[PDB]
Amino acid sequence: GSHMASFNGVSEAELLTKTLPDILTFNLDIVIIGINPGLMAAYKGHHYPGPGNHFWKCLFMSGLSEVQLNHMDDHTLPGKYGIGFTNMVERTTPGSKDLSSKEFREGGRILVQKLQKYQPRIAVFNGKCIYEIFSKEVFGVKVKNLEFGLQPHKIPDTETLCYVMPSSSARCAQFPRAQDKVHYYIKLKDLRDQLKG
DNA sequence: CAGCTCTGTACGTGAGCGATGGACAGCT
DNA sequence: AGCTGTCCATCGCTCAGTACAGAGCTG
């Protein structure tokens, strides 16, 4: 059975009109770029609340957070950990498959402007799909075998690096557990520690 | 032919839903 | 002992991007 009970009598139609505000400041070490808000994120008004989403679990397992945090802690992340949040696409949908190419490319244009303003040390793409679109649109680059981790391009007119991880969503069968994704959060922590020294 | 894009489909975990029914206490 | 209702453990089930085959282009 489905988990519509977790929406506590709020309809899907109402959730589809909701947005998730960005959590951005200057001098951030990391900005997590999600695809777009999912239904639970639009419902809560906080990043990655999906009970199954691996984000908060991987941030703890990797040592990026010293305690197990949850979505309610997302506003504390810039000050305490140097981490911020944004999304490629603003619109709420149940899945990444409901977004058109035009929406992603409009998202990309808005995103590169936000990155050129805030200039985090590292732009982290939480999903391979959004970086494939970003790269083609911003760097004019399309490689046959896009890989995860550090990308060879910096955000134009900045020193901000691009780093790609598999989506924290548990919809992804290729990295079925938070354990299968934690390697990338550890390498992100190692890349951050290296930049800060 | 060869290589490219585009679209459709298949794919593992683990959390949490409603349904079910066993255990058990209250009350005759 | 017999009846009945609640609670809660448990089960069956749902569901939150990515890789890749193969059709359709095009050089």
Residue numbers in the entry: 105 to 301
From the study:
TDG excises thymine from G·T mispairs, an activity that is needed to protect against C→T transition mutations caused by deamination of mC to T. It also plays an essential role in active DNA demethylation, which likely accounts for findings that its depletion in mice causes embryonic lethality. To address this problem, we developed improved crystallization conditions for TDG and solved high-resolution (up to 1.45 Å) structures of product complexes generated from substrates including G·hmU, G·T, G·U, G·fC and G·caC.
The electron density demonstrates that the active site does not contain acetate or the excised uracil base. Moreover, crystals grown under acetate-free conditions yield structures of the E·P complex that contain only water molecules in the active site. However, for those crystallized under acetate-free conditions, the abasic sugar exists in a roughly equal mix of α and β anomers, each forming different interactions involving C1’-OH. The β anomer contacts several ordered water molecules in the active-site, while the α anomer contacts the Oδ of Asn140, the side chain that coordinates the putative water nucleophile in the E·S complex. Our findings show that dissociation of the excised base is required for TDG binding to the β anomer of the abasic sugar.
